[PDB]
Amino acid sequence: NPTVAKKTVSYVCQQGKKVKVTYGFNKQGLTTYASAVINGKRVQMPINLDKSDNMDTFYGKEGGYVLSTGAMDSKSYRKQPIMITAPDNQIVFKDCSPRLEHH
Ligand code: NA
């Protein structure tokens, strides 16, 4: 198993939507998957190495839910805004930033 740690981020999205996403991480601090409960079911989206590059990271298969964001690693992951697209190509969580909890 290359996943050795997992970390969770809470987001606030447009249209008052909220989503919590758990990311798996390997020993190098890269990510291995994104997971979120979507319509009361957990959806597991492995990192898509066909689509991901130096600028953009994508999780999920073609035909499924896809999380898209910027560069993701153990340094960056809690600062990156995300979006989640449904299998039918509708954006179901839009313009999601990680929540400020600072006093
Ligand atoms: Na993030």
Author numbering: 5 to 107
What does the paper say about this structure?
Ng-ACP is structurally homologous to Neisseria meningitidis ACP and MliC/PliC lysozyme inhibitors. Ng-ACP functions as a human lysozyme inhibitor. Thus, in summary, Ng-ACP is a stable, highly conserved protein that functions principally as a lysozyme inhibitor.
The crystal structure of recombinant Ng-ACP (rNg-ACP) protein was solved at 1.65 Å. A second expression construct that lacked the N-terminal signal peptide sequence and instead contained a C-terminal 6×His tag had a predicted length of 111 amino acids with a Mr of 12,372.05. The latter construct was used to purify rNg-ACP by Ni-NTA affinity chromatography and size exclusion chromatography (SEC) in soluble form for crystallization and structure determination and also immunogenicity studies. Ng-ACP was superposed with Nm-ACP and with members of the MliC/PliC family lysozyme inhibitors found in other Gram-negative bacteria, e.g., Salmonella Typhimurium (St-PliC) and Brucella abortus (PliC). The superposition of Ng-ACP and the Brucella abortus PliC-lysozyme complex showed a conformation of “loop 4” incompatible with lysozyme binding; furthermore, helix α1 of Ng-ACP would also clash with lysozyme. We investigated this further and provide a conservation analysis that is based on sequence alignment of ACP proteins from different Neisseria species. Interestingly, there is little conservation in the region around β6, suggesting that this region is not involved in formation of a conserved interface (compare the green region in Fig. 3). While our analysis revealed some conservation in loop 4, this loop was much shorter in the MliC/PliC family of proteins, explaining why the loop clashed with lysozyme in the superposition.
